[PDB]
Amino acid sequence: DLVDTTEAYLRTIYELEEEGVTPLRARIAERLEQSGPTVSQTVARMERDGLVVVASDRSLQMTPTGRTLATAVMRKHRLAERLLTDIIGLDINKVHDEADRWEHVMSDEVERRLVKVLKDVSRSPFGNPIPGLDELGGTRVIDAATSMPRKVRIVQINEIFQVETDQFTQLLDADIRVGSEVEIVDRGHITLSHNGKDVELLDDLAHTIRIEEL
Amino acid sequence: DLVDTTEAYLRTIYELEEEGVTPLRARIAERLEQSGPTVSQTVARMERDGLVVVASDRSLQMTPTGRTLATAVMRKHRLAERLLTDIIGLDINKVHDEADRWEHVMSDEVERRLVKVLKDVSRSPFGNPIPGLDELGGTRVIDAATSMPRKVRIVQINEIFQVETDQFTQLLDADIRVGSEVEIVDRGHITLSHNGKDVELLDDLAHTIRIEEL
Ligand code: NI
Ligand code: NI
Ligand code: NI
Ligand code: NI
């Protein structure tokens, strides 16, 4: 079945977040092929357990601990996939479904071993970066970003102050303006994501674009 | 936790059977670090589900379906171990505990792939044969044995009829006499096991030693 229920919901919410979708209960229900009311029952208990808040707008907001797990689940999932693909040679059409069971039972140590053995752990076979490899072994953007991805709102871009200007069009093409509710992250390497499009910001631009919490 | 409860109990019972131990509820309880009464509750439901009978003598007797699963669980477990060891390079001290989670979520297809990729699937890293590789892709012994291992009783040995005699001592050393409750199997290659010692019987001896059900 789902193997680990809470972890299913956690990885679901991450993945909605990566696609730029608002992690709504109905969205999660749909993705998991579960019922809405079954979904609220689980969300209730994830709340209790400290993994989630149900925000004003009804969006599931992962607590930092919640987001840490979700990231860990996701990293296991993606590495099981690389493992299944690169090494085992499992039919690509079953790799995901399999990794959907293995994500819940892979130890940290096995993950660490997989980093050693595989050729490249930058992305899953399905083209998505693998997160949390570090964990394993108004307000300026440069200052509002952390290690973990938050949706925030663009409050000003300040193109007047910029020497380097080729990213003006990259933002525009990403419909990043005004704004304009985008996910920001970190590493300095800040990324603005908008639905679900990435603009890797050069430092001058990150230092000058300002955000506000939603 | 146990990941899959029924499958835990099934593989436990197999493994008691392989060591020549009588699969008693208290034995299973002890192995799983569960309580006796928790063990009867599970056994009740495995009965319902058709996987087990509780025999006169209070021994758990796997139904053929039960024994088929148990074999499949065991084969997954052992191949996860080979996989963990040979390929992943997981610390040998954690290989078992890990395979204890992976045994419940490995597909048949993944198993089949593992047969291709690994060098030798004859035994687990812990020295136990891997069973069911075929499934995946009074009464004479030759006639009482099937593909799946039954404990039966030795009713006569008939050493008077034997040309080849070097196995006389092999039986004796295995305390196989009179007898004498032993597991028998198949392939012709019949094996008599006694606690938990194997005598691979040559054909003349298998054709002439007679058994009775317990
Ligand atoms: Ni996947
Ligand atoms: Ni899953
Ligand atoms: Ni083991
Ligand atoms: Ni297990």
Side-chain angles (χ1 to χ4, degrees), chain A residues 1-188 190-214, chain B residues 1-188 190-214:
Chain A
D1 214 63
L2 262 63
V3 184
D4 189 294
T5 291
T6 288
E7 289 186 349
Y9 282 57
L10 254 350
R11 211 259 283 143
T12 306
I13 291 160
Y14 194 99
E15 67 180 21
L16 295 171
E17 282 183 357
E18 300 178 299
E19 305 148 26
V21 163
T22 293
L24 300 180
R25 300 128 125 186
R27 279 309 277 268
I28 292 134
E30 186 172 51
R31 205 82 121 185
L32 283 183
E33 87 180 47
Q34 304 281 277
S35 72
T38 307
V39 168
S40 28
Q41 288 177 17
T42 297
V43 162
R45 192 93 267 273
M46 298 173 47
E47 274 175 300
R48 232 178 311 186
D49 276 350
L51 312 172
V52 93
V53 302
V54 173
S56 270
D57 40 36
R58 304 196 33 213
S59 51
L60 296 215
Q61 287 217 130
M62 293 190 287
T63 58
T65 323
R67 175 173 300 288
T68 307
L69 190 38
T71 296
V73 189
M74 186 63 94
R75 183 191 65 216
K76 292 163 188 307
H77 177 76
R78 287 171 182 172
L79 269 353
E81 290 184 330
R82 283 270 51 109
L83 168 74
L84 281 165
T85 288
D86 301 345
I87 290 184
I88 308 184
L90 183 52
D91 174 57
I92 192 67
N93 294 286
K94 297 154 190 291
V95 160
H96 164 78
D97 280 341
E98 192 93 28
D100 200 6
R101 299 187 295 282
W102 298 27
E103 68 184 335
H104 318 288
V105 303
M106 190 178 292
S107 52
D108 295 7
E109 261 300 322
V110 179
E111 297 188 82
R112 291 187 281 268
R113 287 304 314 175
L114 284 186
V115 172
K116 319 275 259 206
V117 197
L118 294 166
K119 198 272 169 332
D120 200 305
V121 294
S122 70
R123 286 162 173 235
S124 92
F126 314 95
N128 285 309
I130 311 190
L133 298 167
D134 276 330
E135 280 70 68
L136 173 75
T139 303
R140 45 259 276 201
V141 146
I142 191 94
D143 310 302
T146 70
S147 76
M148 306 230 77
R150 209 166 72 249
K151 224 180 202 171
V152 168
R153 170 188 346 273
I154 305 295
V155 155
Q156 112 198 327
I157 296 159
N158 269 334
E159 47 288 83
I160 190 161
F161 298 137
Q162 304 299 324
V163 171
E164 299 201 342
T165 60
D166 57 286
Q167 292 196 302
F168 288 10
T169 292
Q170 293 186 12
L171 282 164
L172 255 12
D173 290 338
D175 294 323
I176 302 166
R177 277 164 275 192
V178 168
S180 206
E181 308 165 0
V182 312
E183 35 271 89
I184 84 170
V185 214
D186 219 314
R187 281 153 236 147
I190 285 176
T191 298
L192 289 184
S193 315
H194 194 214
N195 285 44
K197 298 206 228 193
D198 312 296
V199 179
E200 34 201 28
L201 299 188
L202 276 211
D203 303 328
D204 274 271
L205 207 38
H207 268 247
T208 261
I209 309 172
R210 298 261 201 159
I211 64 59
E212 72 193 5
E213 295 314 307
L214 324 155
Chain B
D1 214 63
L2 262 63
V3 184
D4 189 294
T5 291
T6 288
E7 289 186 349
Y9 282 57
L10 254 350
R11 211 259 283 143
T12 306
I13 291 160
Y14 194 99
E15 67 180 21
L16 295 171
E17 282 183 357
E18 300 178 299
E19 305 148 26
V21 163
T22 293
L24 300 180
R25 300 128 125 186
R27 279 309 277 268
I28 292 134
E30 186 172 51
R31 205 82 121 185
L32 283 183
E33 87 180 47
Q34 304 281 277
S35 72
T38 307
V39 168
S40 28
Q41 288 177 17
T42 297
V43 162
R45 192 93 267 273
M46 298 173 47
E47 274 175 300
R48 232 178 311 186
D49 276 350
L51 312 172
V52 93
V53 302
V54 173
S56 270
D57 40 36
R58 304 196 33 213
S59 51
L60 296 215
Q61 287 217 130
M62 293 190 287
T63 58
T65 323
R67 175 173 300 288
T68 307
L69 190 38
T71 296
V73 189
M74 186 63 94
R75 183 191 65 216
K76 292 163 188 307
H77 177 76
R78 287 171 182 172
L79 269 353
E81 290 184 330
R82 283 270 51 109
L83 168 74
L84 281 165
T85 288
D86 301 345
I87 290 184
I88 308 184
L90 183 52
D91 174 57
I92 192 67
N93 294 286
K94 297 154 190 291
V95 160
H96 164 78
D97 280 341
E98 192 93 28
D100 200 6
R101 299 187 295 282
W102 298 27
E103 68 184 335
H104 318 288
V105 303
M106 190 178 292
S107 52
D108 295 7
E109 261 300 322
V110 179
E111 297 188 82
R112 291 187 281 268
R113 287 304 314 175
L114 284 186
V115 172
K116 319 275 259 206
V117 197
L118 294 166
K119 198 272 169 332
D120 200 305
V121 294
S122 70
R123 286 162 173 235
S124 92
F126 314 95
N128 285 309
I130 311 190
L133 298 167
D134 276 330
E135 280 70 68
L136 173 75
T139 303
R140 45 259 276 201
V141 146
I142 191 94
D143 310 302
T146 70
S147 76
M148 306 230 77
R150 209 166 72 249
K151 224 180 202 171
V152 168
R153 170 188 346 273
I154 305 295
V155 155
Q156 112 198 327
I157 296 159
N158 269 334
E159 47 288 83
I160 190 161
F161 298 137
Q162 304 299 324
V163 171
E164 299 201 342
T165 60
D166 57 286
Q167 292 196 302
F168 288 10
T169 292
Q170 293 186 12
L171 282 164
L172 255 12
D173 290 338
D175 294 323
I176 302 166
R177 277 164 275 192
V178 168
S180 206
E181 308 165 0
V182 312
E183 35 271 89
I184 84 170
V185 214
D186 219 314
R187 281 153 236 147
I190 285 176
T191 298
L192 289 184
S193 315
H194 194 214
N195 285 44
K197 298 206 228 193
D198 312 296
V199 179
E200 34 201 28
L201 299 188
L202 276 211
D203 303 328
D204 274 271
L205 207 38
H207 268 247
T208 261
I209 309 172
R210 298 261 201 159
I211 64 59
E212 72 193 5
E213 295 314 307
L214 324 155

